[PDB]
Amino acid sequence: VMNRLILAMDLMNRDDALRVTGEVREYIDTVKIGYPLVLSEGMDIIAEFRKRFGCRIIADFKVADIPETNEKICRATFKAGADAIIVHGFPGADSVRACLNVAEEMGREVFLLTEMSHPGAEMFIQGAADEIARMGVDLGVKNYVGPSTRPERLSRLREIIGQDSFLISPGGDPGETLRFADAIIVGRSIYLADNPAAAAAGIIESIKDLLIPE
Amino acid sequence: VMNRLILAMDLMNRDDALRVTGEVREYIDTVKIGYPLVLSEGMDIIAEFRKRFGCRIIADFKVADIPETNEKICRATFKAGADAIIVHGFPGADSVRACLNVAEEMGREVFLLTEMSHPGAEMFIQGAADEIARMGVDLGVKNYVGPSTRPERLSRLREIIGQDSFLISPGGETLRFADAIIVGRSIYLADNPAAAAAGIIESI
Ligand SMILES: O=c1[nH]c(=O)c2[nH+]cn([C@@H]3O[C@H](COP(=O)(O)O)[C@@H](O)[C@H]3O)c2[nH]1
Ligand SMILES: O=c1[nH]c(=O)c2[nH+]cn([C@@H]3O[C@H](COP(=O)(O)O)[C@@H](O)[C@H]3O)c2[nH]1
């Protein structure tokens, strides 16, 4: 949200993760954290980022279980401090709804992952992408996460979810991506930079130059 | 698996989880744990189950990310002590391959989840099940997880994966096709977990 830039904190050692995040806090307030960091350092790391830096945390857990278990995963995740959680749609409407129910009760957010673009994604994901996105619309999902690369797929997703829905995705960027996504997710280009704060600053400048309405 | 019965430990607090486990260890040696428990108590609880009870641990994490991330998830999970991890097939062969390579490197195991039967699985999962199972066969997968379903349905899954493959699924008829059955609530919510487990095993 802040500056339409989300940091994908994918480092696995706690020191570097905390260091880099604090260094860019001036320009980025939203950070995405996945399982590798959480499983190695504990869920308390989420609480630490929020408590210590006041950032918003998106748990990229790609939740993909049956309804009752999804509910428990979301509860434990929101209890630990996450503001939002990323959920798979392939498991069906029921499994997504369970996540929406907990988010509703706790005042948090669910991001629906509609497709992936890694090799192998063409086997089952690509073919179900539009239908999964439409299922999200039918479920009242308001936040979506896009695959990656291929700007043409992004345009398609936006057409399905509408102008009102919130869409985030990784990376002529940031411009190409932000023609359709509301915020761009950036990891390496920032956390592997000699001066992370400088890299974030540079990208934010590019983003502001776009003069994006609303 | 001891007595062909796997305990699905879906509780979220360490005290109840450890209590039920120690009470059924004379009957069960394999325990399946999920993110609810590990996210609530820490991945270190895996070492507690193994060092304290001698349990084999199956991490039901339904791994479903890109290859590089799946690799990291499996390495952290095996490093914490899991003997095996359950992985989704819908993200494709390469995502599954990444998990299998970490298992090969660390001497552990990967279980491919072929299907689920909850009320919504009919939308995309059911239709992909046979292809996912066949995909596992071609990737050299030897361990599979089947859905909670009528035993007749597991017959088809068994025909696909062959006689040598190892199959587990939520649960006597089921054991006509699956090598072990997975049971959770009937045992861990029981006032007497030991008696519950002993009763299930007697049904053989
Ligand atoms: O579909 C995808 N296929 C990929 O190959 C891929 N690589 C990275 N990611 C996701 O993008 C976030 C940022 O990654 P970067 O460090 O490359 O900016 C990461 O945190 C991931 O969420 C991928 N998503
Ligand atoms: O395909 C499935 N459809 C379902 O509706 C379902 N409900 C539970 N489970 C799985 O079964 C394990 C044992 O659950 P119980 O506590 O009911 O014995 C659990 O740990 C789950 O892995 C399901 N699998």
UniProtKB/Swiss-Prot annotation, chain B:
One of its GO terms (cellular component) is cytosol. Signal peptide: none annotated. The active site is at K62. Substrate binds at residues 10, 32, 60-69, 117, 184-185. Gene3D superfamilies: Aldolase class I. One of its GO terms (molecular function) is orotidine-5'-phosphate decarboxylase activity. It is an enzyme of class 4 (lyase). GO terms for biological process: 'de novo' pyrimidine nucleobase biosynthetic process; 'de novo' UMP biosynthetic process. Pathway: Pyrimidine metabolism; UMP biosynthesis via de novo pathway; UMP from orotate: step 2/2. It catalyses: orotidine 5'-phosphate + H(+) = UMP + CO2. CDD domains: OMP_decarboxylase_like (cd04725). Its EC number is 4.1.1.23. Keywords: Decarboxylase, Lyase, Pyrimidine biosynthesis. Pfam families: OMPdecase. Belongs to the OMP decarboxylase family. Type 1 subfamily. Homodimer. Catalyzes the decarboxylation of orotidine 5'-monophosphate (OMP) to uridine 5'-monophosphate (UMP). This is Orotidine 5'-phosphate decarboxylase.
